[PDB]
Amino acid sequence: KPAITLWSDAHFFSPYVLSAWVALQEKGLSFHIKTIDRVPLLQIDDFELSESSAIAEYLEDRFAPPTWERIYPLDLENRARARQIQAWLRSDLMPIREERPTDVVFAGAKKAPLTAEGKASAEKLFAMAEHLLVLGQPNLFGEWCIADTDLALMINRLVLHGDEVPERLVDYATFQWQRASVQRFIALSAK
Amino acid sequence: KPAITLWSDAHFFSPYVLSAWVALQEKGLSFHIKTIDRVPLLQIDDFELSESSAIAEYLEDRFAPPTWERIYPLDLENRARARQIQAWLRSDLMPIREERPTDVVFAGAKKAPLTAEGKASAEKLFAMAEHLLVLGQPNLFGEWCIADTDLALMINRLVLHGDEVPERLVDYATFQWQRASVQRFIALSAK
Ligand SMILES: [Ca+2]
Ligand SMILES: [Ca+2]
Ligand SMILES: [Ca+2]
Ligand SMILES: [Ca+2]
């Protein structure tokens, strides 16, 4: 057993800490979570690693399927689209991220009506997501992968705030939020 | 031979198009570059893919070493740090990116003195990079990998503008800029 520590924000609100948490939980790895009042930071023995998608990728490389459970798609094109989704969510949609921060997700916080920039960003999210999920599949690529969780978090910034969201995306994001690993993270801030 | 197209901005200034270009060139893949007046976009036969790090990752998965040349480190911890670097550069340092856009790199454009936010961001870059390159190695992990190119681009936003940059980082970024693949991209906009 390697010693594993995941560093979180004190509120357990970071969506990137959520992402790293889910990667760890879905691998079934034993770890301690610690808070800082720079996150997430993974420590495994004498190795340290930051950036939540790099952390998931490392866990998948090091604790490789089929011995440990898989968190990236096996098919290379599905795998590429998973990475595309992770990268896009971290590089785009800044208005949603700024106008709907994750206290809306984890603490029921209410914020202001969307700006013009916020609405345009929300419509871009909806168009992309509807395309990604055009088969109406519960998980992006059939079986769940880490990108489902990240995408659902982004959609839930709107869904859980009460903003109007196409029904199929509500259904997707709500189903993803029932994921056990996600529910276990939510519990950290519920009390 | 699959049909490969890479879509670039019309000026060949995108640092993300540069990154995807370098991944393609360093794999030794045959491709056409096309411009749009959403980039980079990779097309390979009937598959499409966006986000420059996802594109490199796909190329490494699909055109796998040792048959094709390697663009990510073999060691899993070095590989993780490469991904950490790629992810960090795309998610942080926004002031450098905004105050030193890549026309400074590819067209010798001159911009304004750094803001207070810009200087703080530059010092963060310098501290991280000096740490990453503390052995004074020409490439981050010994052998070159795609993260060297991305990191050098970020440093060169400052170096090529004339901003003051620690000598070891100047030396690093200048050496990386001599990479044949990078020189081939530069040629696109030189004329
Ligand atoms: Ca499984
Ligand atoms: Ca396939
Ligand atoms: Ca080589
Ligand atoms: Ca190692």
Swiss-Prot record, chains A, B:
Disulfide bonds: none annotated. Residues 75-191 form the GST C-terminal domain. Coiled coil: none annotated. GO terms for molecular function: glutathione transferase activity; maleylacetoacetate isomerase activity; peroxidase activity. Its EC number is 2.5.1.18. Activity decreases as pH is lowered from neutral to acidic. SUPFAM superfamilies: GST C-terminal domain-like (SSF47616), Thioredoxin-like (SSF52833). Disruption phenotype: Deletion of yfcF decreases the resistance of the bacteria to hydrogen peroxide. Residues 4-67 form the GST N-terminal domain. GO terms for biological process: glutathione metabolic process; L-phenylalanine catabolic process; response to hydrogen peroxide. Belongs to the GST superfamily. Exhibits glutathione (GSH) S-transferase activity toward 1-chloro-2,4-dinitrobenzene (CDNB); however this activity is as low as 1% of that of GstA. Also displays a GSH-dependent peroxidase activity toward cumene hydroperoxide. Is involved in defense against oxidative stress, probably via its peroxidase activity. NCBIfam families: PRK15113.1. This is Glutathione S-transferase YfcF. It comes from Escherichia coli (strain K12). The gene is yfcF.
